[PDB]
Write a protein that binds this ligand. Structure first.
Ligand SMILES: COc1ccc(-c2cc(=O)c3c(O)cc(O)cc3o2)cc1O
Length: 238
């Protein structure tokens, strides 16, 4: 992810088949001739897509030009949360399935995984960051407090951002309950709120290298969203 001053990011295509699949996902959803109401509605929850991009001197080097959803914030607090019960896709080998389940064996149980966070602390004018090992260390016993940390600025719990996040996620949940054409594996929600205004958050769906056509509800994704909403809801009683 390369941040560009113009308010966009350049996401480098992942190696094949993942990069190519994410490109085709964005191209499908943002097709200029698309009249699919499910897909038109989905656009509301994704970063705006500005097409494929590569450097002038390097046609080989492929990127997705996307809206930087953090650009309108002064001190953006950012959390990446993987959603679903399975983070492997329907066509993974036994070895790949095993590797993906071992990366976080509670995925089925919890339905989501914190990939990282960057939280602005008001008193020090500084950020505290957590890497992938933070969320992977969380269990049922510690997920509520694990998620809460994102919304604590060193002085208070930002319950305004927690409540706004629930409301934004609820619209995404509604979309998932009104579609049976796509299932999403190893995809995330990107949470952003203002660290420095009240109730102002972004929640956007990202990471689409394992989105597949389907005939059914994405049950794993629904479970994950529901559980995530429940955890956030409990944090409002802190
Ligand atoms: C300084 O930290 C960040 C700043 C911006 C982002 C960011 C911002 C984005 O808008 C974004 C996106 O649209 C798609 C995507 O796959 C990833 C994205 O990441 C992520 C960050 O960790």
């Amino acid at each position: 992810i390369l941040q560009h001053p113009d308010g966009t990011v350049l996401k480098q295509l992942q190696p094949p088949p993942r990069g190519p699949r994410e490109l085709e996902f964005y191209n499908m959803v943002y097709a200029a001739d698309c009249f699919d109401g499910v897909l038109l509605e989905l656009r509301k929850y994704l970063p705006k897509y500005y097409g494929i991009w590569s450097p002038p001197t390097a046609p080989n080097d492929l990127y997705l030009k996307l809206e930087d959803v953090t650009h309108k914030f002064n001190k953006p607090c950012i959390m990446d949360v993987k959603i679903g019960q399975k983070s492997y896709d329907p066509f993974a080998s036994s070895e790949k399935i095993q590797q993906q389940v071992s990366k976080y064996p509670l995925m089925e149980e919890i339905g989501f995984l914190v990939l990282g966070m960057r939280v602005y602390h008001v008193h020090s004018d500084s950020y505290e960051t957590e890497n992938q090992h933070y969320g992977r260390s969380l269990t049922k016993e510690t997920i509520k407090d694990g998620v809460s940390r994102f919304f604590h600025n060193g002085y208070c719990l930002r319950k305004d951002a927690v409540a706004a996040s629930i409301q934004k996620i609820e619209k995404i949940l509604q979309w998932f309950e009104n579609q049976k054409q796509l299932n999403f594996y190893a995809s995330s929600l990107l949470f952003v709120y203002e660290g420095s205004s009240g109730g102002e958050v972004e929640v956007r769906m990202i990471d689409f290298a394992h989105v597949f056509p389907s005939n059914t509800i994405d049950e794993g994704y629904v479970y994950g969203l529901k559980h995530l909403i429940s955890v956030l809801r409990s944090i409002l009683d802190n």
